[PDB]
Design a protein around this ligand. Structure first.
Ligand code: CEG
Ligand code: CA
Length: 752
């Protein structure tokens, strides 16, 4: 025996859960039954014929990478069901044989050195197929001969012999060369795998392009926020490879691995909400039925559990605490339901360890300036804001996936509450893709995939407690411009719109919300204190409404209230919509079965060719209609200004004032005066202290932002980069935003 053999067994238990597995456990058993069932289901359907032209009727066609990739996964599944303890097919030599025969069959008939390394969908030829193959190689390792185990590892080397791509792709190459390295007992390769993690898009932060950023953002394909998509994969593979290499002579030594710990804290933690990974950062993957938000979220948490096995002292315990809290929070879909058996083993030991307490829930506001995203986490709810600009594209759609992601990241709001299934249970293929909440669009017309023309997209963060965001809207697909802002406070989110103009000749509308209702679609809702009809298929206009209340799909924790300051007229309809995942993901393996969900859609109608139109609403999560009515009577909010040049909102009770300035001219909102495009927020504690945060959301100003506050101060402390030039009679200071990359600069003044 040698090291390589140790590593291989370590990976074998990663896939199986080792001989340790306790089939008595209800969840270990549940997973096992399915593996065996599915495995059995395939096997007893394979064409075992000597002269077969295919291994599975359904997957025939040696030329389509999609099919070939799937025949390998199936095999991998049977390998596991044949290798994991407790399985109805454990040890079954017959099964192992057939699997092996299937592999040989593909070496000559479909997967070998003949095919182009660049054939259609290299991902399958260079990463997908090989990852599965390795896993099989490791499991049936003993039952495999040298001649046989060569036709496997040689072909794999042919397709992926090096490491040299970006983030997710680079990491995948690394796990492919790394695993085939421990089976072929090669060290040169194995070290090239460990070293790969130090490459672009992984360990080292990125200042542009793919990879993780110091502000917690993650980018893939150069212009798309992908934390929950390709990012999800990166976390998983990197963690899996780092764990395999931990404690070996090929252990990771790069100092930047420390960054991996921060990924969890700043990159993933803020984007998880009770088991779900927010879709706004999942890209084109929101169109995949097998990968909805909680399923995807479980995988992220599994990578955390894995990470907690070798993580240094401080971090390991923190990880255990975070995972424990998430396993417990998710009452929608059981975590143990869709993760590997070894994952269930390791987690169960954390959840049952009484000494490990659940980490606290996050309570903050974070601006991911590098990917045009912003999050708000409050005890009762969370808000996801998806923006785009000259730096980040509207949405991604390649390989006929996500054909309706048009406005998924165009100022879209995502509200998370007790209704944990809002975005799961086939939301995407049934929701009206032309009406994504928070957005302003030309009714029923789409926009293309690509970056925008305005640089003003970002926001400011006041000590990570509160914030404000903005997006200068201007579509290329058709004439339409507007100024959209959002102000996140303690229990309400204010949305303002102005400069709404168009010549498209198409009715422009702003969608307040589009909520999926319960199975009956009978959620109770009220407007101005009057119950409204709850029948499906009914469309109605609400004139002069000051507030609306919609009951959630759960007894408590999912109600939503809407406040319209100067009164508004809403176009609404409640209906049952039908669709298929096939419609937003036209690939062979995607389900065509029709599904039906209920929605309550509400929007403001700006008319056709409007000029200077505007809107203003406040979202009030978890409040009863009686409260929403109360709020509307004596609101803690007060619109300071909603013009084309500046949008400002004040929070009477918190002493908060937010203001986004859209032009490089001198303008003033309440006590704030600015001379440049900027996002500002201040907090005033009567005769005590005054705080202020500023940011250049354009990330293009290479000079300064001259700010002036209408208050007299006695002293101050400011982040470096802020030069205060006058404390009395009024506060004056400048902010050096050259290369600030959208960050927020803070400063606190003591009043007299
Ligand atoms: C196996 C599958 C799939 O999801 O079907 O095939 C294609 C792959 O390439 C994409 O770039 C990734 O998003 C990855 O997640 C995909 O995995
Ligand atoms: Ca409030």
């Amino acid at each position: 025996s040698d090291e390589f053999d140790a590593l291989r067994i370590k990976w074998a238990t990663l896939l199986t859960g080792g001989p340790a597995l306790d089939p008595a456990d209800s969840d270990i058993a549940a997973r096992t039954d399915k593996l065996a069932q599915d495995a059995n289901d395939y096997w007893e359907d394979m064409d075992l014929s000597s002269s077969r032209t295919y291994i599975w009727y359904a997957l025939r066609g040696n030329g389509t990478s999609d099919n070939v990739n799937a025949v390998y996964e199936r095999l991998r599944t049977m390998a596991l069901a044949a290798t994991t303890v407790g399985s109805s097919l454990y040890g079954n030599a017959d099964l192992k044989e057939d699997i092996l025969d299937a592999l040989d069959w593909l070496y000559v008939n479909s997967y070998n050195s003949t095919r182009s390394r660049s054939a259609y969908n290299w991902w399958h030829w260079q990463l997908g197929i090989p990852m599965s193959l390795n896993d099989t190689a490791v499991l049936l390792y003993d039952d495999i001969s040298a001649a046989r185990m060569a036709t496997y590892m040689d072909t794999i080397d042919y397709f992926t012999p090096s490491i040299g791509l970006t983030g997710a792709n680079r990491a995948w190459q690394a796990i492919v060369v790394g695993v085939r390295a421990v089976i072929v007992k090669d060290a040169v390769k194995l070290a090239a795998a460990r070293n790969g993690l130090s490459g672009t898009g992984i360990f080292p932060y990125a200042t542009g392009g793919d990879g993780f950023y110091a502000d917690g953002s993650f980018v893939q394909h150069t212009t798309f926020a992908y934390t929950g998509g390709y990012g999800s994969s990166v976390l998983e593979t990197t963690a899996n490879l780092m764990y395999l290499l931990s404690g070996s002579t090929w252990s990771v030594s790069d100092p930047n691995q420390s960054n991996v710990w921060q990924w969890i804290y700043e990159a993933y933690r803020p984007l998880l909400y009770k088991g779900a990974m927010m879709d706004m950062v999942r890209g084109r993957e929101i169109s995949r039925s097998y990968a909805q938000d909680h399923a995807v979220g479980h995988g992220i948490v599994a990578s955390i559990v894995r990470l907690a096995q070798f993580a240094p002292a401080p971090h390991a315990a923190a990880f255990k605490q975070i995972a424990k809290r998430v396993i417990q929070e998710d009452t929608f879909s059981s975590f143990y339901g869709d993760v590997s058996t070894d994952t269930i083993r390791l987690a169960k030991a954390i959840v049952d360890d009484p000494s490990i307490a659940p980490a606290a829930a996050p309570n903050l506001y974070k601006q991911y300036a590098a990917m045009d995203r912003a999050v708000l986490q409050r005890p009762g709810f969370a808000l996801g804001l998806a923006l785009y600009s000259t730096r980040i594209s509207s949405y991604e759609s390649i390989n006929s996936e996500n054909g309706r992601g048009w406005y998924t990241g165009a100022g879209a709001t995502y509200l998370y509450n007790q209704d944990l299934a809002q975005y799961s249970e086939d939301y995407w293929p049934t929701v009206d893709a032309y009406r994504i909440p928070g957005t302003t669009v030309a009714s029923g017309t789409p926009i293309a995939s690509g970056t925008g023309t305005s640089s003003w997209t970002g926001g400011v963060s006041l000590a990570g407690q509160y914030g404000a965001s903005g997006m200068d809207l201007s579509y290329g697909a058709y004439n339409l411009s507007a100024r959209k802002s959002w102000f996140m406070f303690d229990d309400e989110i204010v949305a303002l719109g102005s400069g709404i103009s168009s010549t498209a000749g198409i009715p422009i509308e702003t969608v307040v919300d589009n909520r999926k209702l319960n199975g009956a679609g009978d959620n109770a809702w009220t407007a101005n204190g009057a119950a409204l009809s709850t029948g499906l298929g009914v469309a109605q206009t609400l004139t002069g409404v000051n507030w609306v209340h919609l009951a959630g799909n759960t007894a408590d924790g999912s109600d939503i209230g809407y406040y319209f300051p100067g009164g508004a007229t809403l176009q609404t309809k409640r209906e049952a919509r039908t669709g298929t995942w096939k419609q937003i993901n036209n690939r062979p393996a995607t389900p065509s079965t029709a599904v039906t969900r209920n929605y309550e859609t509400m929007w403001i109608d700006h008319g056709t060719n409007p000029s200077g139109a505007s809107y203003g609403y406040v979202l009030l999560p978890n409040k009863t209609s009686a409260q929403v009515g109360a709020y509307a009577a004596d609101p803690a909010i007060e619109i300071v200004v909603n013009t084309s040049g500046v949008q400002s909102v004040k929070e009477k009770t918190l002493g908060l004032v937010g203001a986004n300035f859209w032009t490089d001219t001198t303008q003033t909102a309440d006590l704030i005066t600015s001379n440049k495009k900027a996002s500002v927020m201040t907090r005033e504690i009567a005769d005590e202290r005054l705080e202020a945060s500023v940011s250049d959301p354009t990330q293009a100003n290479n000079g300064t932002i001259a700010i002036e506050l209408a208050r007299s101060a006695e002293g101050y402390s400011a982040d470096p980069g802020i030069t205060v030039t006058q404390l009395a009679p009024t506060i004056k200071f400048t902010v050096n935003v050259n290369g600030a990359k959208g960050k927020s600069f803070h400063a606190s003044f003591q009043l007299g």
